[PDB]
Amino acid sequence: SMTEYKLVVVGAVGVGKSALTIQLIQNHFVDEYDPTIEDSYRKQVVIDGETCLLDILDTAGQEEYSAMRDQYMRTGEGFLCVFAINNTKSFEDIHHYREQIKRVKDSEDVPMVLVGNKCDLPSRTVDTKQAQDLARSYGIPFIETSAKTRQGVDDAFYTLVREIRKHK
Amino acid sequence: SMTEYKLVVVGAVGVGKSALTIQLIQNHFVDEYDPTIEDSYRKQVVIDGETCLLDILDTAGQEEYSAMRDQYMRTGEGFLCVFAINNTKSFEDIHHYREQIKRKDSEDVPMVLVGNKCDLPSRTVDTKQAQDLARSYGIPFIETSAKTRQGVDDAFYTLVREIRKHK
Amino acid sequence: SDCRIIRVQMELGEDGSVYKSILVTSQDKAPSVISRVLKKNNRDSAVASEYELVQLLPGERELTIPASANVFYAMDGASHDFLLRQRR
Amino acid sequence: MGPGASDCRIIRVQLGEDGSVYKSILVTSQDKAPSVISRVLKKNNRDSAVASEYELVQLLPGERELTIPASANVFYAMDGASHDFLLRQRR
Ligand SMILES: Nc1nc2c(ncn2[C@@H]2O[C@H](COP(=O)(O)OP(=O)(O)NP(=O)(O)O)[C@@H](O)[C@H]2O)c(=O)[nH]1
Ligand SMILES: Nc1nc2c(ncn2[C@@H]2O[C@H](COP(=O)(O)OP(=O)(O)NP(=O)(O)O)[C@@H](O)[C@H]2O)c(=O)[nH]1
Ligand SMILES: [Mg+2]
Ligand SMILES: [Mg+2]
């Protein structure tokens, strides 16, 4: 019997939720586009000396499958809210995602980490200023990542874990 | 009344076929990605002085809906074959698309190749190898960009030109 | 569980589009689908509580989907063609 | 006055490091076994698979399993009381 952590990755289509998860778990990035419906991962790993089994849920960005959202948001322990730095729309979508997390299992303090995903890309359409400012108002962490270079991947996921155990 | 042209936009996932179709009409580029199954559009516009109504079909890139390929390829008049300049895989995918179109029962079908991401810095396929393919297919080749709108008009109109040419 | 692909046409005040193909799960209720097609269209501003999803059947026969119904189970199954209109 | 045929079904498909438990996959009323195998295999970034090497088998409740015949319509072949499959090879 070890500690089980249930992470769930939410965000707009294409923000790179699947890519980050595949990076953490399989240590690789393929450029291939592949819309996901629902991918489940289970991996054992030690974090800050604690052996635990990670239950990561790679969710769909497409509304088509958000018919499942009330169930998987119920079950989930912590939520990784992802936007792409190039996609402004994704960033605005976070509002909606959080509210949905709050409404399901009514609580205003839920373990979350906001993530800005494609930080290697030159475009940069959203400032980290206005992102970190949101995170401050949400009073949650904020990590800029890149599934391509693997920058921040470990940091992001593990932080959510830390946030989860912090909310026993 | 009006001359009717039935265009159909095919290509791999994410190449940006939806983006440029939607750019054609009510002119805009939305960065939001929304995978398409089969979207139908209709617009009247003049080409080389000819008023005509375009029947554009924005097809899916996802294998899941290739089950519809035999139907939409039957009905369609002309085919816009799209790859992304950054995705080498998309470029290789065109082979498959064309051969499926060839199997209308003709070695010549009105079609035009397009490379949609001409604005991206990280080109993985050169124009040389693209126009060389187009020469072997004996069809045009236009580098477009749904973002900057570069070549969108050119690309669509060319397919129209190819259509009227074909009879 | 099972899904269906349907095509839905908008109110189309402007030229817009002819139709958009849409996937509906065995789990989808009418609001889900209406907001889905509403977002597909350039009516991001529009509330889904206002619109009505109407199946078109042969013989110029229509069927309006109740606001609360599961469209997957509601639809007549002699048609995959729908239409969205104001209901104002 | 009678249900229409369904277009697609969502199934979950589970060799190698099983970082992933399962992936949700869409299968049309038109899909044959190879279509589905290559689909899940390409999700799994295992491009080298010939598709004719792998086998897609359904796991029913009560620890009972059944293998889906290759080049057959998976939509109609499956028991429809499961939804859960797995991929395996043959060295
Ligand atoms: N350069 C770069 N590309 C990325 C990054 N993350 C994802 N991508 C790319 O962006 C695309 C979308 O990634 P993906 O993980 O499928 O997105 P998603 O958020 O899972 N979309 P969906 O909701 O359909 O599952 C893919 O081509 C992927 O390779 C990143 O950090 N950097
Ligand atoms: N920079 C840039 N982005 C583009 C271009 N064309 C498409 N995109 C982007 O790439 C993504 C995919 O766009 P979309 O047109 O939906 O792709 P698709 O070929 O229709 N995909 P699908 O097969 O699912 O229908 C979107 O985020 C879009 O903004 C382009 O020329 N330049
Ligand atoms: Mg994905
Ligand atoms: Mg699309």
Author numbering:
A (entry chain B): 0 to 167
B (entry chain D): 0 to 102, 104 to 167
C (entry chain C): 647 to 734
D (entry chain A): 642 to 655, 658 to 734
Sentences from the study reporting this entry:
Ras belongs to a family of small G protein that switches between two states, GDP-bound form (RasGDP) and GTP-bound form (RasGTP), and regulates a wide range of cellular activities. Ras acts as a signalling hub where the RasGTP, but not RasGDP, physically interacts with multiple Ras effectors, which then transmits the signal to downstream molecules, including ERK, Akt, and small G proteins RalA and RalB. Activation of RalA and RalB is mediated by guanine nucleotide exchange factors (RalGEFs). There are eight RalGEFs reported for humans, and four of them, RALGDS, Rgl1, Rgl2, and Rgl3, have a Ras-association (RA) domain responsible for Ras-binding.
Throughout this study, we used recombinant bacteria constructs of human KRas4B lacking the C-terminal hyper-variable region and the Rgl2RA consisting of amino acids 643–740 of human Rgl2. To purify the complex, a mixture of GMPPNP-loaded KRas4B and Rgl2RA was applied onto a size-exclusion column. Crystals of the KRas4BG12V:Rgl2RA complex were obtained which diffracted at a resolution of 3.07 Å. The space group was assigned to P1211 with four proteins per asymmetric unit (two molecules of KRasG12V and two molecules of Rgl2RA) arranged as a tetramer. The complex forms a 2:2 heterotetramer where β2 (within switch I) of KRasG12V and β2 of Rgl2RA generate a continuously extended β-sheet, along with interaction at switch II of the same KRasG12V molecule with the second Rgl2RA molecule. KRas4BG12V residues within the switch I interact with residues in β1, β2, and α1 of Rgl2RA. These interactions include a salt bridge between E37 of KRas4BG12V switch I and R653 of Rgl2RA. The switch II of the same KRas4BG12V molecule also contributes to the complex formation by interacting with the second Rgl2RA through residues in β2 and α1. Meanwhile, two KRas4BG12V molecules have direct contact through switch I, switch II, and α3. Importantly, the V12 residue of the oncogenic G12V mutation is in the proximity of the ring of Y32 of the neighbouring KRas4BG12V, contributing to the KRas4BG12V: KRas4BG12V interface, increasing the hydrophobic pocket.
